[PDB]
Amino acid sequence: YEHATTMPSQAGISYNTIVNRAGYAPLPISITPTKIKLIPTVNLEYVTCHYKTGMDSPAIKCCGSQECTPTYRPDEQCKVFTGVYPFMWGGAYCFCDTENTQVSKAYVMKSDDCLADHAEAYKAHTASVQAFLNITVGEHSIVTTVYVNGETPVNFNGVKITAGPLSTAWTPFDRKIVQYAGEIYNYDFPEYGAGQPGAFGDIQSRTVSSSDLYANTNLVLQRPKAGAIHVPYTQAPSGFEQWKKDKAPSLKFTAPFGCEIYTNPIRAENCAVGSIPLAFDIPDALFTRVSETPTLSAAECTLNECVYSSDFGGIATVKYSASKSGKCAVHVPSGTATLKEAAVELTEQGSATIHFSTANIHPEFRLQICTSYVTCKGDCHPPKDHIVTHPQYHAQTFTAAVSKTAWTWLTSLLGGSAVIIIIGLVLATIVAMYVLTNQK
Amino acid sequence: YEHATTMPSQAGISYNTIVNRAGYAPLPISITPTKIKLIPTVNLEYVTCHYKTGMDSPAIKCCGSQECTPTYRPDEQCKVFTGVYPFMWGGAYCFCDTENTQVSKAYVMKSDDCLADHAEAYKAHTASVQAFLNITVGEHSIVTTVYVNGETPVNFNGVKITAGPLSTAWTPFDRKIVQYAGEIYNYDFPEYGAGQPGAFGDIQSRTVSSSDLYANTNLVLQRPKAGAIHVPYTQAPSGFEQWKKDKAPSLKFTAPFGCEIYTNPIRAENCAVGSIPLAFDIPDALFTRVSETPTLSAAECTLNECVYSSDFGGIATVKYSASKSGKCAVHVPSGTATLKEAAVELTEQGSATIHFSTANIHPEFRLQICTSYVTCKGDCHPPKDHIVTHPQYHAQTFTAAVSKTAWTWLTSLLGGSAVIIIIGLVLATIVAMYVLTNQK
Ligand SMILES: *[C@@H]1O[C@H](CO)[C@@H](O)[C@H](O)[C@H]1NC(C)=O
Ligand SMILES: *[C@@H]1O[C@H](CO)[C@@H](O)[C@H](O)[C@H]1NC(C)=O
């Protein structure tokens, strides 16, 4: 037997359904999503950290001249200044008043703390969805991780279940993300080899331990102060620190649908968007006979009280006279009510209590028990709390909240609108016939 | 200055261009794609090898009975055969004619050679195009690897180059691929937990070193032969061996566009499909005035000998009277002829030889020397050989193969037909005017 359903993607809320064969005992199915994970495929672009301007010692040549060598270091600047008179603690370092040269070098490398304080730039695409499910089909239970691609099956006790694909391709991450301090930022970082001074990614390394290091920090060299041995430089401040000074809240606080953003692996959790289409394949062996299950006779539904709150605010009692005791499946085929439980113990004679949640002011729902179908009615009242802390446990309709009062003052006005028109047409036809009969 | 162009995605064939500023010297561009890679993103979900049916030694009980241990191993199953009379080498094992029970159980493991002789199943999507480009602008050259995404820039001598994205999204790998022995197959394998006996993936392991193994081989235990201690079993022949027997040629032999599929990483190299858009950002310091480059005047092109073969069949010469010697660029702006080189040495006076490849019988091509522009004309002969081992070095138009005789015949038939129509219309108008004039 092939069954199909569509469970909304909402973690922590059970989904109970029933499989009714033509002449066999109903089969209860329950799916409880404990966690739904959306894991994008991220590849590392580069890693950024604070830079250190490691600068070589000034080489001073007295009474002579020097030349500069490249030395091939990241963003290295080498310059020779002519006319220096350096001073040490011991006195004048050089014995020529002029024509003394001082060559100074200044390069940049990753800071000593880049092994811990760094931000990784990722590119995200083709997100994959996984879901932790507690499944119960015909008393056969399982707790498993199912990939929400529509094709990967999870199988147990001969029953196969294929979940997904998710109805939406929406993902909280853009094409470029920045992970820093275990917290994902939705940033449009510069490409490798295209960083700019004073902004994120001014220095870029392909990997934390990679030897290569692109560096564009606008480093220049200034003339040393007279009578001083040092390498003066003026470069734009660190782009990593500037980015951290103003980076906006992360996706933990800005992602739509209330997604929870986690790292290692970069994933989103409990995104309340879309629905997962479930496909069950139940072998014919699991469908038992009708006589084995209890058969219900002379059952009626009484709605003790109904309050259309988010949680299970409605309660009903079914007066039943069953053929025998045992487990019995209960369901509501309509979408006007959702039962808390998909099964109930049943005796030979008595009353069964059923908890349900609804959004109707006046419920008219066709409850189903072991085999019979009992219509359950009543009225509901508004709940006593304005704001709650749990999501809605049911689904509403556009005509759910229209009470009998609204129906009366909508039908009387619209019906009365038509009645007067019909009266007018009838009078017009009658007088027209009378006029034609007046013609001699 | 920003220059946007396109380049055919054909490895080996050099692409030559000239950028022309308003009053500055023309600047040459030469891009040689040595190798183009198309690398899909692959996720490994399982591996498959030959299985080994392990069997526990039978547990024999004389005048007794035994019970089956619960199954805990891949495809493991147990059976207790009653009424056995085992018969070892040292006579009968049991002194008990009947009520002797032999427990025989079997299961499936990976073969001892699964570390080397295994095929791994991948899911491929979102191919990432890469290229190896040797680029030359303004006598400055660089050989590098360019990611053909439309954003990653390559920097050299202050010049930005951005290649891509590829004009087509075609990839040779299907959604599901299989890698075995360095060869890639487009196989729609069953996914993990859905392997079938006797076919590829009958036994599945998430990784090579993973301790999990899904086995489905129709392992069935049979009753032992009388007086024999052994575990007789029956199962479908290994699906990996069956797949190896008839798996069809790998992608290396069946891929369109002449792709070369390699492994580690799984990639397709040198596919003759699509075109690569190129964008150069050239700093204005590279452009030099026309005075610096050797200006040229009083030049003409004579076509020495033209044959419209795939290679550089045509040879021409230009008689030049240059102001001074030096480098000077040459290029055909149109697509009716592709030059062999992009620069030539010019003396004070003389003649310079040019090699070009053309596809038209009569090449009327508007050659562009670095300063003077010469229209070069002639006739071509067909090549001698029917088949060559080189690809086509030129681009042909729909009207390039039409000879002068065909043009005369078409402009005769069409054209003269319209002239005959025009004569008839003129005669009709003239006689209509004549008959209207004769009203009186
Ligand atoms: C399903 O299993 C999860 C995890 O063990 C548990 O939190 C949840 O209450 C279970 N649900 C049912 C209906 O057993
Ligand atoms: C570019 O470099 C490659 C590798 O060194 C070489 O094979 C090729 O001929 C070069 N192209 C040009 C135009 O020099």
Swiss-Prot record, chains A, B:
What is the recorded membrane topology of this protein? Single-pass type I membrane protein
UniProt PTM comment: N-glycosylated.
Please identify the protein, giving its name as recorded.
Spike glycoprotein E1
Q: Where is this region: E1 fusion peptide loop?
A: 84-101
Annotated glycan sites: N134
Q: Which cysteines are joined by disulfide bonds?
A: C49-C114, C62-C94, C63-C96, C68-C78, C259-C271, C301-C376, C306-C380, C328-C370
**Which stretches are Extracellular in the membrane topology?**
5-412
Q: Which organism is it from?
A: Venezuelan equine encephalitis virus (strain TC-83)
